[PDB]
Amino acid sequence: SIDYVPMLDMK
Amino acid sequence: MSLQNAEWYWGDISREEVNEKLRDTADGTFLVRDASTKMHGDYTLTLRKGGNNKLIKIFHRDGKYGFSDPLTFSSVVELINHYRNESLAQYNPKLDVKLLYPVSKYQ
């Protein structure tokens, strides 16, 4: 990823 | 303070120090440091995966902790302990790992 890893929402 | 005694929490160390510790290690190796932000009670999980270090942000809102909406864990240890036994794949398909090997400040 660019810096931080994208984490998906669960809502 | 469960978090301060957690072997895998290193508090206020740098991205560069973490890179030294995570260098050449197996996938699943991980530690938690303080976020580069100014004390939003925010921490950063760093995880070895595929030969590089994934920066995963641990958000802190209301009184809860977590990787994304909704924040449902009541402590960072509760959160890390959970994903020791369950992969992070549901947050991001690239992250088909658990937190397997803690980088231990006692060891």
UniProtKB/Swiss-Prot annotation, chain A:
It is found in: Cell membrane; Cytoplasmic vesicle; Lysosome lumen. It comes from the Eukaryota. The modification Phosphotyrosine is found at Y4. Autophosphorylated on tyrosine residues upon ligand binding. Autophosphorylation occurs in trans, i.e. one subunit of the dimeric receptor phosphorylates tyrosine residues on the other subunit. Phosphorylation at Tyr-4 is important for interaction with NCK1. N-glycosylated. It is linked to A chromosomal aberration involving PDGFRB is found in a form of chronic myelomonocytic leukemia (CMML). Translocation t(5;12)(q33;p13) with EVT6/TEL. It is characterized by abnormal clonal myeloid proliferation and by progression to acute myelogenous leukemia (AML). Myeloproliferative disorder chronic with eosinophilia: A hematologic disorder characterized by malignant eosinophils proliferation. Tyrosine-protein kinase that acts as a cell-surface receptor for homodimeric PDGFB and PDGFD and for heterodimers formed by PDGFA and PDGFB, and plays an essential role in the regulation of embryonic development, cell proliferation, survival, differentiation, chemotaxis and migration. Plays an essential role in blood vessel development by promoting proliferation, migration and recruitment of pericytes and smooth muscle cells to endothelial cells. Plays a role in the migration of vascular smooth muscle cells and the formation of neointima at vascular injury sites. Interacts with homodimeric PDGFB and PDGFD, and with heterodimers formed by PDGFA and PDGFB. May also interact with homodimeric PDGFC. Monomer in the absence of bound ligand. Interaction with homodimeric PDGFB, heterodimers formed by PDGFA and PDGFB or homodimeric PDGFD, leads to receptor dimerization, where both PDGFRA homodimers and heterodimers with PDGFRB are observed. Interacts with SH2B2/APS. Interacts directly (tyrosine phosphorylated) with SHB. Interacts (tyrosine phosphorylated) with PIK3R1 and RASA1. Interacts (tyrosine phosphorylated) with CBL. Belongs to the protein kinase superfamily. Tyr protein kinase family. CSF-1/PDGF receptor subfamily. This is Platelet-derived growth factor receptor beta. The lineage of its organism: Eukaryota, Metazoa, Chordata, Craniata, Vertebrata. The chain holds residues 748 to 758 of 1106 of the full protein.
Curated annotation (Swiss-Prot), chain B:
Isoform 2 is expressed in skeletal muscle and brain, and at lower levels in kidney and cardiac muscle. Isoform 2 and isoform 4 are present in skeletal muscle (at protein level). Polyubiquitinated in T-cells by CBLB; which does not promote proteasomal degradation but impairs association with CD28 and CD3Z upon T-cell activation. In adipose tissue, polyubiquitinated by the BCR(KBTBD2) E3 ubiquitin ligase complex; recognized by KBTBD2 through the SH2 domains, undergoes 'Lys-48'-linked polyubiquitination leading to its degradation. Residues 8-103 form the SH2 domain. Changing M1I: Does not affect insulin-stimulated lipid kinase activity. Changing R84Q: In a patient with severe insulin resistance; lower insulin-stimulated lipid kinase activity compared with wild-type. The SH3 domain mediates the binding to CBLB, and to HIV-1 Nef. Binds to activated (phosphorylated) protein-Tyr kinases, through its SH2 domain, and acts as an adapter, mediating the association of the p110 catalytic unit to the plasma membrane. Necessary for the insulin-stimulated increase in glucose uptake and glycogen synthesis in insulin-sensitive tissues. Plays an important role in signaling in response to FGFR1, FGFR2, FGFR3, FGFR4, KITLG/SCF, KIT, PDGFRA and PDGFRB. Likewise, plays a role in ITGB2 signaling. Heterodimer of a regulatory subunit PIK3R1 and a p110 catalytic subunit (PIK3CA, PIK3CB or PIK3CD). Interacts (via SH2 domains) with CCDC88A/GIV (tyrosine-phosphorylated form); the interaction enables recruitment of PIK3R1 to the EGFR receptor, enhancing PI3K activity and cell migration. Interacts (via SH2 domain) with CSF1R (tyrosine phosphorylated). Interacts with PIK3R2; the interaction is dissociated in an insulin-dependent manner. It is linked to Agammaglobulinemia 7, autosomal recessive: A primary immunodeficiency characterized by profoundly low or absent serum antibodies and low or absent circulating B-cells due to an early block of B-cell development. Affected individuals develop severe infections in the first years of life. SHORT syndrome: A rare, multisystem disease characterized by short stature, anomalies of the anterior chamber of the eye, characteristic facial features such as triangular facies, lack of facial fat, and hypoplastic nasal alae with overhanging columella, partial lipodystrophy, hernias, hyperextensibility, and delayed dentition. The clinical phenotype can include insulin resistance, nephrocalcinosis, and hearing deficits. Developmental milestones and cognition are normal. Belongs to the PI3K p85 subunit family. It comes from Homo sapiens. The chain holds residues 326 to 432 of 724 of the full protein.
